[PDB]
Design a protein around this ligand. Structure first.
Ligand code: CL
Ligand code: CL
Length: 164
């Protein structure tokens, strides 16, 4: 298991523009296009991202390319972030993926707001962090996903993803 497989399971893959759980225009493997309620804005963002006239549809290779860009961006983003980098550096490999997962979903800003959970993770207080992590909108809005990521931080294993 690795971060790509992990996110591929959490985000799914759709080749046509679609609305994510928040009702935002998205495509491929969780690639957010825009927060605007406008589909044209979405299609425009799509063409710009891909570099051609897509009319709201992309190929699997195009999806995978965006995905490669998005994961790189997330890691790079974490590494650049004063609040996140130290946590990331403190973690083992599997748990690093769980952190990447959150940043991919909520953005570096959002995750950086989990101050308390972050301190806990840094301190390696797995159970306590897991409880804190669950007291969030994130958990209440996307519980199955949150549970998987949380279980990952708690255990340091892929068990939450094995069998999916
Ligand atoms: Cl809550
Ligand atoms: Cl969910």
């Amino acid at each position: 298991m690795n971060i790509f497989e992990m996110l591929r399971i959490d985000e799914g893959l759709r080749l046509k523009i679609y609305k994510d759980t928040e009702g935002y225009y998205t495509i491929g493997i969780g690639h957010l296009l825009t927060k605007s309620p406008s589909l044209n804005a979405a299609k425009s963002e799509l063409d710009k991202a891909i570099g051609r006239n897509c009319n709201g549809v992309i190929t699997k290779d195009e999806a995978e390319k965006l995905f490669n860009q998005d994961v790189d961006a997330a890691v790079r983003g974490i590494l650049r972030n004063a609040k996140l980098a130290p946590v990331y550096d403190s973690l083992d490999a599997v748990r690093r993926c769980a952190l990447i997962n959150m940043v991919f979903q909520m953005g570096e800003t959002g995750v950086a707001g989990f101050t308390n959970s972050l301190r806990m993770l840094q301190q390696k207080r797995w159970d306590e962090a897991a409880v804190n992590l669950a007291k969030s909108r994130w958990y209440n809005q996307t519980p199955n996903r949150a549970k998987r990521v949380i279980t990952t931080f708690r255990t340091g294993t892929w068990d939450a993803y094995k069998n999916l």
